[PDB]
Structure formats: C-alpha cells, structure tokens
C-alpha cells in the first residue's frame, strides 16, 4: 500500500482520500495506478455502492508530479489504466472538490458521476496545448458532454480554466458547500454527513441498476476515446515537443 | 372512452386534458394506455400538427394511482405501450405544466418536445430508488439529454426533485406564464391563445418535416432505452422489493 | 476573386471578412460557394491553425440575398457545398459575431467552433417554417447540440430568434466584448488582439490534434444530417410552397 492516498469502507461508501497536501496532491504514475486499483477494489466489493474520492489542502490535485528513456511508455500506460478504471467502474463515483484540479486528475474529476465543491474558487485546468500534448483521460468525450463544444474549445485550445461560474451554468457541480478552503477536513466530513442522510430510505441496488443503464449511453464513446487519444498522443511524443516543454 | 382524460381537436391542435384534479391526476394503467391511444389517434389525423397535453388542479400528475398476482405484467405492459407512443409520435408534442409531475407521468413530460410552466413552483420527481425500481419511460436517455449526467445522477440516485431553477438553467421550460396555481384553467387557455398567435403565417408541414429530422437524432437510443429498461426491471420485480415498498 | 468577401493570412490566423455592410452582408449562392473555397484554402495551408470569420456593419449576415427555372438546383448545391466545408474543416473555426445572423449564414455560425459577440443585442434566426422549408446547414444536429432540443423546438417550430440570453445560458458565446454596434471594425480588431495574446506560449499543432479528436464526436451525424436535409428538402420545393413565399 501507499502513503500518498488512503482508503476505508463505511457502510456503502468506499472512501479514497488523497492525503498529501504538502505537495498539492500531485501524483506520480504509480499513484494513478494505485488509484485505479482501489477502484477495481471497490468495484468487486459487493457491500459498496458509492466510491467517494476526497483530497486535502488547498488543491484537489495539481496533477502529474514532475521529478533511450521510455519513461513516457509509463506515462502512457498510466493514462490508459486509470482512465479505464473510471470509465468502467460500476459504483456511483462521487468527487469532493476541495480546490482546483489540473491535468489527468482534472480529467478524472470529469469522469465522476457527481461532484460537490468546497466553494466558488474551485476550477479545472487542462494545460495540454501548453505542454504540446492533446486530450487525455477521456476529455475528448467528457468535456464537450458536460460543458459543451464551444466552451470546451475556448478552454482547451487556449489553456484556460473551466472556472466555477461555468461549472454551475452547466450543472457540473451538484452542490456548493461554501466553506473556507482552509478547512478541507470539515468539508469532506460535511459531504459524508449529507450522503448518509440522503441514502436513508433508499434501495441501493436500484442506484447501481440505474448507473448501469445511464453508463451505457456513452460507454463505447468513452472507450473509443481512451484508445484513439493514446494512439494519437504517440505522434506528439516521438516528435519530442512535450519533453522540451517540461521545464 | 374515459372519464379521467378528455380530448378535442381545434384546427391544428389536438388537445388532451387530464380532468381529474381531485385525485391529483394520478393515473392507472388503463389511463396511460388510453393516453397512448389518443396519441395514436392524433398521429393518424392529417389535420393535426400539435398534440398539446394539459392537466388540472394543483398537480400535473402524481403518477401511478396506487389502489400469482401478475398485476405487474400490466404495470410493465403500461410502461412499454405509452412510452412507445411518445417516442414515435410525429406531431409536435407540447406539455402544459400546471404543477408537479411524478413518476411515469414525469417521464412523459421529459419526452415532450416543448414544455411551458404555470409558475416557478413546478418540479419533476422520479422516485425509482425509493420504490426499489430503476429508470422507466425513456428517462435513461431523456434525463441526461435534457438536464445533464451529473444533475441526473444527483436527482435519481438520491430521489430529489428536478426543480424549476434547474429546468430554466437547462432550457427545459420554453416559457413561464407566472400565474397563480389556483387557476390552471386560465393558464391552459393562455397557452393556447399564444400558440394560436405563433402559428399564424407559418407553413405547418415544415414543422413536421423538421421534427422528423430532429427526432432521428436519438430515436434509436430512445427505443433501445425503452427495451432494456423493461428487461432489467424484471430482475427487480422477481426479487420482490418494489412490492414490499408499496405501503 | 470576389468583392463582397475578402481575406488575408496573419501568422496562424487565416481571416475571412464579409465586407458588404450596405446590403447587411446578404450573400448569394456564389458568395457561399466562395466562402466554401476560402475554407478549402485555409485548410490546405499548413501555416494556418485558425480560420477567423468576421463581418461588417450592424449585421453579421441577413442570409440569402433575394434578387423550367431550376435556379433552386443552385440554391441546393449552395447548401451542400458550403455546409460540407465547415463540417470537414480541420482548422479551429472562430466566428466574430458583430450583429444578428439569419438563415444559412446563421447555420454556419452554429458550425463554428468558437463564437464571440460584439454585444448583447446579437441573435440567430432560422426562418425555415416561415418560408415553407425545413432545416439546412446541419442545424438538425447543430442546434439541439448547442442549445438543447426543447429550446430548439420552440425557436424553429415558431420562427423565433435564439437570442443572446439563450446563447450565454448554453455557453454558445465564449465571450462578449460589450462594445457599440456602431463600431464593428474595432470589435474585430479587439478580438484579434486577444487571440494574439492567448496563443502566445502554446504549441499550435496540439490545437489541431485536439480538434481532430473533438470533431470525431459528431462528424458522422453532421454528414448524415447534411445529406438527409437536402433529400427531404426536395419534397418541399417540388410542392412549390417555398417559391410562393418568396415575396
């Protein structure tokens, strides 16, 4: 197991927690892999109906941690594995956004089923054009779907944040808790307090039955997207440009 | 014919009216069937270009009326038939929302082409998780399409209303008449007054031509949805849980 | 070359300009064709990454210029060619909306990737029902996608504008410059000033790589749409009604 990311179960809630606020929860390849496996884990567990993903500090995650060298063949394997696990996960994926997210970790927020926000200073940022890359983590599908093509084009092409006012206008954030971003702990605990309230009286196997159908609406497109995003990425690595621009 | 639901024709407008406000226009299986047949009716009638669906009282409809017992094989046959008729209907479907709608009658509001609202206290509610069921009436497709996946997940998974402020933010309501919900009669009559204004000067066969193309965008998905929703539902009935939870 | 529409290149920006404000930039068939060819042009040019489309005066365009007569077989050939060129264009399409757009020129605004507006008095209008026609310029796909089915039905069926407040609520306008619509010149120049700012530091081949993937999400539907819109249109011409209603 891993000291940047913890997890526990709590009735129907399998809870994953990024516990490295000092480093703005930047994640390395093996961290993304681990995160992928925790989902595989919650997904086998027959008592779990909701995978909640929380973080810490002032950022949800600043994304990739930057510290023949086909280290990029791991970078790529990273993308595929973790993106696959989200796309396919059958439990209801909930993300507690305690601050900005960037890069692949931002793409993963966009694959979650429900998102809640600590306050209105949150944003998602996809700096691909800036690092001479293209879309990853299913964003080809996930961004236009959840924010619209024209907004997606404005943000991706010109490396601009999908800010909070955009998130509400498109219903991306299912609720804002409007709390200090000093206290991520209380926000994460407030969310789970309410989740515990909302599930009372429900028949949870219905939720999974319902996700099973809703998921079918785009599952093929999500997978197609993951596949072709990776293929086309290689054209960009072999050119070399991404590397020069890691500085 | 049937004493819970009336209808008349009025130039291009085939008007269907739920006329049972005392019982908050709850509908039984045969009522949904009848409603399905009235659409088949308007759909054959070559003078009709708009099927308007109005109700009465303080509710548009509270949905299913609850009053070897394979009565559920009728419940199921109900869903399939009436959902089919909406999906396939070729006239422009307009719904005059005089108050909340619940359940299948709420799903049918989501299949209508245009919706108008009496005032800002209207809502749609889909209590499937609460009755140990899954999605029905094409909601698998219709909700994410018209409100977005993240909002759909928040409302369905946790049995919460799609309230009015959500409906505007997603353009679901094409106009609010902002009238007392004492007077549904005047609201229904105001809507038809305006509809009569708006059609003047138009070439109505163009409207049907245009719906024919727009409809093609999701017709397969709607049908796939109706089919698999029903199949998967049976897994839930045979378990029994829906029944225990009718109390 | 053509005296109603100019163009120049300026680093990565291929700029097309409708320069006939006196006639509210109404366009004839051969004008739409030319516009189609300018795109084919920018699309071959390997130094170009953005095709910017600007206009002049108080209108972006009032659409079709109205001034055995199978002149309609040219009307139709017009639609197909120019709609094809937009659908398929691989450079990032940006449209600077200096005032209202109508008809096919409005449909082409809806095919652009990004749109900016001079001020909040802009609108798009699709008067097809009014001229006994159906959808053209891919609007069958483009309108519901970018504004939603219910709003699309309200505007098309009843010949009403997609006004500015609707455009923001659906993220259609990626930024409003809030300037006098006296001065279109300054607005067009302000847009290009900012575009020049935003591209600095980026790796432009990433933008085209990203559009290549995003475009794939609906390219088949757009093409299907162009094809069947044309086929079904002929049923309406042969009836004659469009012609009677050109007065």
Swiss-Prot record, chains A, B, C:
Q: Does the keyword Secreted apply?
A: no
A cellular component term (GO) from this record? peroxisome
Q: What is the effect of changing residue 136 to A?
A: Loss of activity
| Induction note | By oleate.
Active-site residues are 136 (proton donor/acceptor)
**Subcellular location(s) per record:** Peroxisome
InterPro entries xrefs: ClpP/crotonase-like_dom_sf, ECH/Chromodomain_protein, Enoyl-CoA_hydra/iso
Record's keyword terms, sorted? Fatty acid metabolism, Isomerase, Lipid metabolism, Peroxisome
Query: What catalytic reaction does the record list?
Result: a (3Z)-enoyl-CoA = a 4-saturated (2E)-enoyl-CoA; a (3E)-enoyl-CoA = a 4-saturated (2E)-enoyl-CoA
Hey, which pathway is this one from?
Answer: Lipid metabolism; fatty acid beta-oxidation
BP GO terms, sorted: fatty acid beta-oxidation
Pfam (any one): ECH_1
Functional summary from the UniProt entry: Essential for the beta oxidation of unsaturated fatty acids.
**Stated family:** Belongs to the enoyl-CoA hydratase/isomerase family.
Tell me what this protein is called. 3,2-trans-enoyl-CoA isomerase
- Species the sequence originates in: Saccharomyces cerevisiae (strain ATCC 204508 / S288c)
Q: Quick one: which gene encodes this?
A: ECI1
């Amino acid at each position: 197991q891993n000291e940047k990311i913890s997890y526990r179960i709590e009735g129907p809630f399998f809870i994953i927690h990024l516990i490295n606020p000092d480093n703005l929860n930047a994640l390395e390849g093996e961290d993304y892999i681990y995160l992928g496996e925790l989902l595989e884990l919650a997904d086998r567990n027959r008592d779990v109906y909701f995978t909640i993903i929380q973080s810490s500090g002032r950022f949800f995650s600043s994304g990739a941690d930057f510290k023949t060298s086909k280290w990029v063949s791991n970078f790529v394997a990273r993308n595929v594995y973790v993106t696959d696990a989200f796309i396919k996960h059958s439990k209801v994926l909930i993300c507690c956004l305690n601050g900005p997210a960037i890069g692949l970790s931002a793409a993963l927020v966009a694959l979650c089923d429900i998102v809640y926000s600590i306050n209105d200073k949150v944003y998602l940022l996809y700096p691909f054009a800036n690092l001479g890359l293209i879309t990853e983590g299913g964003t080809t599908v996930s961004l236009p779907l959840k924010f619209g093509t024209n907004t997606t084009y404005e943000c991706l092409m010109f490396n601009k944040p999908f800010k909070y006012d955009i998130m509400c206008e498109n219903g991306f954030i299912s609720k804002n808790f409007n709390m200090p971003s000093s206290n991520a702990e209380a926000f994460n605990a407030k969310v789970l307090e309410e989740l515990r309230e909302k599930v009372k009286g429900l028949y949870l196997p219905s939720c999974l039955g319902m996700k099973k159908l809703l998921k079918s609406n785009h599952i093929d497109a999500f997978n197609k997207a993951n596949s072709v995003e990776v293929n086309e990425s290689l054209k960009y690595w072999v050119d070399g440009e991404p590397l020069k621009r890691f500085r």
